[PDB]
Design a binder for this molecule. Structure first.
Ligand SMILES: [Zn+2]
Ligand SMILES: [Zn+2]
Length: 91
């Protein structure tokens, strides 16, 4: 019979470097629908708003056509999710 063996080392080290900056330019265009949503309906928070008087309320922001608010009470208006009051007549 017979047999044998062998071997060989190995190594390496790459190298790369670069970098560049680009200027800014606000093209002539109006706003975009890419706005955040607050109201429960998850729709763009527009002017029509009242804000929940409750400071704890995370949303504390809704519309009028979602909670029936003819106008902005700018007073003591609590969202229909916080009030959760209990009585004879529900609503
Ligand atoms: Zn809404
Ligand atoms: Zn609330």
């Amino acid at each position: 019979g017979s047999s044998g063996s062998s071997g060989s080392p190995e190594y390496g080290m790459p190298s790369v470097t670069f970098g560049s900056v680009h200027p800014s330019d606000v093209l002539d265009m109006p706003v975009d629908p890419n706005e955040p949503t607050y109201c429960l309906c998850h729709q763009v928070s527009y002017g029509e708003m009242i804000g929940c008087d409750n400071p704890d309320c995370s949303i504390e922001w809704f519309h009028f056509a979602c909670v029936g608010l003819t106008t902005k009470p700018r007073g003591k208006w609590f969202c229909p999710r916080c009030s959760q009051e209990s009585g004879p007549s529900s609503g």
